[PDB]
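Section 5.1 Outputs to date
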Amino acid sequence: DSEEVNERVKQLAEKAKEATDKEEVIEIVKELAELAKQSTDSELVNEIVKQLAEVAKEATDKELVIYIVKILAELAKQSTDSELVNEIVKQLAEVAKEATDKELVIYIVKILAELAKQSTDSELVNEIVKQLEEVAKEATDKELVEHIEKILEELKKQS
């Protein structure tokens, strides 16, 4: 049923945000991810993404954050719903901009590059370019800046 799955998500999300066992949180996130990937209900998927992004943005376990980022990337790449893809890009960019874990930032940069390269929507591509430029402007890592500059040139050349 609809109401029942909504309630399952509500309880999982609460449990995830409260739990102090990291393995437990990973398991909850995995269940949420499966529910989102199996759903054809945009409302449910949007709610799950909201909750996952909140867990990620509150978390202090790097493994959990990158796991959630991976889930969100997969949901975005598999979606044909521009509202959802835009929202995921927003969340990923917000995680990238404030992260102090360089591996996470370059993973997100790569995901964003892939989404842009795989898009024919100029609104999305332009937004990703904006976010990547902002990450590059703020970065103190020459290699990262060089990689972003390469991506931006590739995007320019592509379209």
